[model samples]
Target chain A: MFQPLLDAYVESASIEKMASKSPPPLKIAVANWWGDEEIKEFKNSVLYFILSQRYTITLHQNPNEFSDLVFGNPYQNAKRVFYTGENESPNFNLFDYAIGFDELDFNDRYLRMPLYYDRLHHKAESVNDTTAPYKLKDNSLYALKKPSHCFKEKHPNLCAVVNDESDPLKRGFASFVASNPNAPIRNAFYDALNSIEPVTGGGSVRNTLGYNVKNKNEFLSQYKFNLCFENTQGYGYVTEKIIDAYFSHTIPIYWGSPSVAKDFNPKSFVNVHDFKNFDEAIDYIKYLHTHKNAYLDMLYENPLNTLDGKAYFYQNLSFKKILAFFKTILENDTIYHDNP
Target chain B: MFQPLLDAYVESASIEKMASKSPPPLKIAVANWWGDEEIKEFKNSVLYFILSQRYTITLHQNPNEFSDLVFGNPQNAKRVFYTGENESPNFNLFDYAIGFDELDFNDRYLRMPLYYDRLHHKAESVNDTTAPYKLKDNSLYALKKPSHCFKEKHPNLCAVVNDESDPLKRGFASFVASNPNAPIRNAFYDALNSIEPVTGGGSVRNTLGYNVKNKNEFLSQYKFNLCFENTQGYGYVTEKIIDAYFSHTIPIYWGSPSVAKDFNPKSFVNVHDFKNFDEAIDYIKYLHTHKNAYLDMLYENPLNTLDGKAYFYQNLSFKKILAFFKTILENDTIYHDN
Candidate 1:
């Protein structure tokens, strides 16, 4: 009887439409990138999603006679277009068009694309895929050695994991997993957190365990908190450190950016920048550690700061602006770089 | 020419095909509603949106003669069909009902949120069928004035206005139009006003001589708007917070424990998150003193992550309600008959 109603609202038509058709393929070349895999398999790269919304892409290894445009970093010579995620501004002289992490007013020649936005999309893609490259083996040393558990039913008594002691709760007090011990801020947090209770140092910087962990997410999952401070502090310099911690479902002890709260929910994490000093951050951490309900409250909160599972980066304003930036460049035959 | 591209996509035939086969009208009666306007003009009511997707509706005043179904609140003397946002459903009295509470009974009940009805009503008024539906006054991209213009144009720190248009007053305004006796609402008003003078433009505490007629225009003259809800509950969010956002002012909201689930919590100053009224006031004072911090909150997109139009049309949608109603009509034996 209601079969007609069900048939009318078919799965194919009911699903949200993509809204736009793909334009002609653009032959773009990549050069001077940090890694070869990302540039070679361009479909997997974050650049693919941003550009593919407007045009079908055909990525080239080098700038040749057939190539329409070239995208690379400042270190390269043959590239006509430049892009960077580092703390570097775009050199308008070397390239006709540029995309950098700087907060630049995007014109025909420049686009202010942040590194964190790319990492956020990348993390979402990886977690959703069953055949993802990031997935580790079930019998990995870290997965077997640590208690494979979730936040709700975590072990209560055991705070940290040590080679000498027995493992009780699948969850520990905190974890600091970074190769760089030389970082002044990160090292101070690691030392301070260790003083309160033993913080498992699983990274190459301060290896408490016998060996380095194979999978980072698997190692971090058996802990309540993650010491996820960025390498440097700048206006919009967010990397994969905090993003990784969120994916691991651990509360990130974030520091480095003062304006981090603007992008992230302050309630979800222990923002050291919010406190006056390191001791004050530690005091709050201790309070959270003792109060189980308070810790669970923060643990249960959505890390994206959004009720919808989608991130703010997926907003139409940002995506449409980036699309418009590329469309303007592609439509024009001439490359205008008279003014810096 | 782009004529081929434009002409090919001109108003697809799917919608026309669906409208062709018209269904027979169903006679339904309504009773025990708070207002007669909603029941009399049933076409305008939320019930119309819920039921009209399946069958053409013919609303009757009484269930005596020709009505196929009856819909009303539990307070009705007759044990007919039940539905409400006011309170819990009396399952014993009325066999079938539509409720707003998060209950487990689904055999003869439908849990349709009241907020969805309000959202659908507002959305329908603004969105025309000629183009793709887009939400107004909810995005930073939709704002007429740039962030820099707030300091130049809006001289006052905050604003609070009701329905009446009294033009003389300005600065730190608080519009308390209804339920002035609400303890939590009054407590927040007293605490915030103590930090800096908050102008009261509503009937509860009328500092201004007359009521403000133009709501959005009056609200745009100030930086913040005190849009606290009259009642506190899950899914009880109303137009107060939405109105404040439409005016491009930061809303200090108090009700709805799960408000964040429906909105971006970072966009507004949620008083429930704070330990007490004093703590919420402290944050407000901080935002007032700091220019950049206030601008950051103001510039935040008022819409949730889900596109407003898509959310309204898809989730808790007309199609879902139609299916729910179809089951009720098809069943020969009513639960009350047992």
Candidate 2:
């Protein structure tokens, strides 16, 4: 529902770039941040990244007497705008404009952007830079089919030995790396898979490989399948787990996030949520393991679901849309007067 | 160097059990500890663990006039036996001592690694049913990797690279409690923040409004942890790097000149290996940008090998600790009256 609004705002904002005439520098103060104070420096923070794109930002610390605007989470005083990456709904009474994780209707006051989306934005910016020593395409579409090329390019040293087996089946079996042993659901799936064939445990709990693996994707790349389970389930709470599996060129045995198919293509990997039970999921895994063609077909499938000939995951979660949202907040003077 | 002495002592002590007659309970006091106050209890402390095995232990708070022995690091009352989890342990201050250092075994001193005590406490506290192994007889050797995929058997890095669409995902985290004024720690934090924001969750330079309640839980959220020790020394490896391991985050270790002796050097980013902080920062920046190179470091086994066994299991076992304490307790000649 919010996607259409975001697309419209982005399209409208794309036609209208920043005015050539320089305006007075807008003073913005960030207060009550949950993480690092470095965010105020305009180097690593997402809010700073988004706001700097539209306006000439003069960043200030908290308790500024003459700041034009204030952006903060729930706690700070005199906050004109609210933003949070945590699973919190923005209170309308406290904030005039809010950017949060809640799936709200297309109200001009609210912008729904999840924390994971912000993480993805940071990753894309870091990896896509030509100045970086190592570079790779930041798109999921490129990672779908040619994972071997990606893996080799990413890890030149490991590829010397890893390239010996072009066929993934010739590599080791499945791999499961996680720290939390208290997760019953994920643990059960591991046991079920282990019964069929030895699923290499590279985590602290069942650590059969002698040591807990340092690089999860590199360790997973050697296996045919990866058990990518979420720490918890929620709406729009898709983390980096499944994406990691796809990037490694390993088929993801995914669980959690009932609405995950909305983000990722169902044909690309095994959605354990689709199966009736653990046995049913294991049966399908066994079938895929034995049938090379079927396994290859699933592996080669486009990992991202597309809309209008573009990857929806990239489009929906783009920093450009976030910029557009911030533009709307900056352009509207009615919000300031109505609240103050 | 101390193993032969320990073996001889254990062998000799095996012949001599505690006197057949019951003796009055010996009161001991512990003070000047660095970590949790719970260590004063006999249930989880290694000093208590070893001492209780030989005699009846009645623990007293510091400044007690009645204690027969006072176990402490540096500062405490009439200390008969000196013990330290930290690097600084004065052998001259007490009649006997136990510490983490390369000291030749004498009747007056025993070198017991602090990590062993911490590992023993964690092993004793293991209530997780899903754990593959149990803490049997307080022996780390019993913690064998499980073969059976039991249904009830309990429980328990790499997502940082491939999903590079978002620019804000990966963060370097630090959970320091004290020494905020330390130049090296502040320098590292500033340098890392210049590249990207390093999440400071500890009391020292906390960007987070509050100090994190659980260190491991807080560490799990980020890819890298700035695990610099409070003070740099030869044998001052504390719970900082170990906590990072349990949380599955890569540690940026600086203290402990011979850390590779205890841990696999490949597993973590050792600042000591580099010529300077700038060189270390350059490598860290390289790792941040290069996912494959980062994972290469991450995949290495965290434990160093010695005689086809984990060095900790061979050297820092509870049995060795028991023998050290038992041998000291049985001998009357070692004690010097003040």
Error of 2 at B21 (Å): 86
Query: Alpha-carbon error at B128 in model 1, in Å?
Result: 67
Per-candidate TM vs. native? 0.40, 0.40
Off by over 4 Å in 2: A1-42, A45-48, A58-60, A64-83, A87-89, A122-126, A129-154, A157-165, A180-184, A203-206, A307-310, A333-340, B1-338
Compared with the true structure, what per-residue lDDT tens digits does model 2 show for residues B84-177?
A: 4343333334546666544442445565656545544434334233332233332332344433432122111212222222213445655556
Candidate 2's C-alpha lDDT? 0.60
lDDT of 1 by residue, B6-95 (tens): 121111101122566786788777764536775654556565755664578887666355566776664222234433333445444464
- Give the runs in model 1 whose Cα sits over 4 Å from its true position: A1-23, A32-42, A63-66, A75-80, A129-170, A306-311, A314-321, A332-340, B1-338
Instruction: Write model 2 residue lDDT over A1-340, tens digit each, in one string.
Output: 1122223223322323358756447787765453455553445555565555566777666564666667766323343787755434444445667776434442566676655554444433433433322234333321222322243455433343334436666767798988888677888878888988999988996678899887775688778888888765544456667766765667899986666787777888899889879899989999999999999888877776767765466336555667777667767754321221
10 residues in a row with least lDDT, candidate 1 chain A: A1-10
Q: Docking category for candidate 2?
A: incorrect
- List, residue by residue over A80-169, the lDDT tens digit for candidate 1: 677765555444445667776543342466675666656655543432333222233344311223442332223212212322143323
